[PDB]
Amino acid sequence: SPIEFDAIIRQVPDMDAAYVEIPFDVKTVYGKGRVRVNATFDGYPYTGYIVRMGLPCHILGLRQDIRRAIGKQPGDSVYVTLLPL
Ligand SMILES: [Cl-]
Ligand SMILES: [Cl-]
Structure with missing residues (x-):
């Protein structure tokens, strides 16, 4: 059961790098610290980390190559899903 949400890149x-803000309380939902996730961005799979910036600010990086695969840039909206690993 993935967590799913629209997000602005x-x-x-x-x-050159881009990211999405995680729009829920990551500490409560997943527990403390970095979170390894199986994510998708408009359906395109990616494995990586939700990381803490200044609490409670959490982001997930969106790699340049994935951005080219789905044809989305900063300012564009992207549908994200998340599953913890
Ligand atoms: Cl929340
Ligand atoms: Cl972190």
């Missing part, structure tokens, strides 16, 4: 200005 965010980017630190002038950098």
Whole structure:
């Protein structure tokens, strides 16, 4: 049973990398610390980490190659699903 949500692709200005903000309380839902996830971005599979920035700020990185695969850039909306590993 995946957690699923729409998210805006965010980017630190002038950098190449992108990410999505996790729109729920990651600490309560998954427990403390980094969370390894099987994720999808518009259906495209990715395995990686939800990481804490300043609590409670959590993000998941969106790699450049996946962004090309689904044709989505910063500012675009993406449908994300998450399953813990
Ligand atoms: Cl929440
Ligand atoms: Cl972390």
